[model samples]
Target: MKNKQHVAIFPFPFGSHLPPLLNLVLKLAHIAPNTSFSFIGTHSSNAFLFTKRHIPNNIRVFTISDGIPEGHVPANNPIEKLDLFLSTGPDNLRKGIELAVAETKQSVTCIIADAFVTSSLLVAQTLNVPWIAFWPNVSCSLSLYFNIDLIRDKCSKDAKNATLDFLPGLSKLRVEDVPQDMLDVGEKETLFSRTLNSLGVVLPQAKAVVVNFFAELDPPLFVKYMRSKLQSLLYVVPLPCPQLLLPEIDSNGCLSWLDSKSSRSVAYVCFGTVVSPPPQEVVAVAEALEESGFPFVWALKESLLSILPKGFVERTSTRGKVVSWVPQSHVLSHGSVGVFVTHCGANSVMESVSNGVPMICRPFFGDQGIAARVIQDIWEVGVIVEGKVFTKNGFVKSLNLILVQEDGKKIRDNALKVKQIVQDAVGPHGQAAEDFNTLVEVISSS
Candidate 1:
């Protein structure tokens, strides 16, 4: 076998999970030329990777059947999807690992798998290779997930609006701030139980935990708390700011439209891939964008167009452009995008902050609410819209607050500060770089 370091990467088969993991692979290839990587996922995921313009020569991609019917693994039922993956994943992944190792004649030095996919841990343990849980979420969210059981326990009697402050660097959190799975009242054991059980067992058993978060963004107290809980070394490598990775899809028209607008003048609207807001919220957003009287680009799925008010497009034709999809990273990077009205997914929030764009947060569920809280309260770089029901007036009010009010300037400035920190963290001498070096050394020594 060649003397090259071999590492296997397994990611949860989600659209959001692939980019960051692959991006990390690309970065590692650059930094450690002797290292080779194998990316393991489903067939469709492997196909998606090939669509990209570049895949480093040192990296090989492989797939294992998820044991779900074709195109069924990623259906709307997240719970069922997760359960199916867990049930069939271990055997399939184990088989794939054996094949990869045999074909390449390279023993994997380490296995870095998604934090949620505990099946990978068993394979890594059997092979005696270090297994690192590649946590794709933010540090705060992970910290919460790691201690979700404890948080739920603390919420015993005061289920309604209970607050938790035991975790370091975290402010008092309402019970609702906990991930939905943990808060579910259903008697049947569900994904939440599976997640807590898996992490509780697999995390401690793993060699170490690697998270896509910068120490700069996390409170030192929270970092310390996580170290004690995981009982292993923690590594921080913040997600690199998003870049234009998908060149197969043309973005010239959107870029041209953005160029025509003045700097910091347009609101970039998107809810990402997974969550589709109710028609009411969708229309509320449209009404808000129109009422705010701001030039905007709403990335709406074509199916969602049915929700728009009558003559909405004709009315806002001059000021608003609604496209089914746009290159999000590029749109956020554009000078004309002033505020991102988003659902506050970790990826979207990080990308927006990296580009110095504040957000109008409208979180739907799960980590999104937590992410929204962190962005609005902790980071002070965004504002969460008030109330449960979508209101056109509320939308107008929130946009004006972020765009016209004095406080908006403060939020914008704070976002820029975060952008600089993120840029520096990814720079040669920054915290992320130092941590990456340490992580490489750890992998090498093991």
Candidate 2:
């Protein structure tokens, strides 16, 4: 047999980045049987992956010292470890590349790394491989991240306590809508600003960017933000697992639940792996569910949901199911799921549209606000929940507007229509498919 393409994937040290990168690696491996991907991470992260899935034959796992000088943390607080990684990820990644290369005879053909792990570019350059910065986010998020300085500047210049109404696609934004770290950046000089500055420097050095978003979902935004700015090598790829699983969603239980409800009667609620709403907000959501009178399946992580408001679960037990993470594809694909009340996380947005579900945006931190904007403004697939950040009838009102009101039907229909667009954008010979193939060809030959 001839030599096969080799790709190493290293997402930022976070669970939010892992699933998408892992799914992409699996997708890439399926696309080419000869392909082999080595997923590199810290011992803790790699162990987590191994525990989740038996080590696949085509996938390799390796670990570094959590991107820190050995024994830097006296007791190894993950928070401190993560802080260390942020400071030293590039150097650690470079060392990891050298060590992995020296041990393996098969030369690494390409590198697919997370946007935050900017040091992958240095490794790829040294190894003479394709270095693709993968952003598991929508075009709106990428646009904000790539132009992070603009947003940061705006935030910095705005008056303290002022509501920002200037952002595109958003009805209103506040300093609080941003991640706490970013808001810290907006305040007196801080580490978050410095770290973000470093990321900006490293991002432009990448060979190309991979956006984990289908082309059809935001063609105009992609053309405007990604295609026009970056080196011509930017590729928009679908969130692989969701696309693959959508067709297989026997979805009987989910669909049956939906079918039992009136048309578009169910509201889907899920916060991404990170960003649990505070206990009070969770109860407020329950109150909103009761107020809206819509059936809901709120996918909560087991680690969370333990701290809900007193009698919260019992109060809405009939109308809501406080689930510990159901398969989202099957749930969203159900006929009854009309609107997704979400954190506007990119993965959630992509998967929701893949299943034709609209959104009730409750954005929290990072690029989630940007994603919410796209769904509500550009794609017209959803309604935005604007105003105060704290727990104040905000959750309930958004749910009511999206589920109990007549205007939400438009959001629902628009969501289904955009789903068709997303399908075509990722289908055979579609723009996303072509770009992805071009990316592979570039990797294989470079």
Best by lDDT: 1
Backbone clashes for every candidate come to: 0, 0
lDDT of 2 by residue, 1-446 (tens): 77667788787767766777777777676666666677888877776556645544667777776655655554432244455666674677766666556555567888989877666777788787768888775555444445455556767787644544543433344444454444454445344345544654566667787777765555453455455556654556655554233334332255566667776678888887768576766766766666666688888777666676667678787777777767776677777887888888777787788888878777766667667666776677886664534244676666766666776767767877877777666667777778878777766675
Which lDDT values do the candidates have, in the order given?
0.77, 0.67
| All candidates: TM-score | 0.92, 0.83
Which candidate tops TM-score? 1
Off by over 4 Å in 1: 1-4, 70-75, 154-156, 159-162, 185-193, 231-244, 248-252
Model 2 TM: 0.83
Q: Candidate 1, clashing residue pairs?
A: none
Q: lDDT, candidate 1, residue 300?
A: 87
Which segments of candidate 2 are over 4 A away from where they belong? 1-5, 52-56, 67-81, 145-149, 158-193, 219-222, 241-259, 301-307, 390-394
Query: What shift in Å separates residue 421 of candidate 1 from its native position after superposition?
Result: 1.9
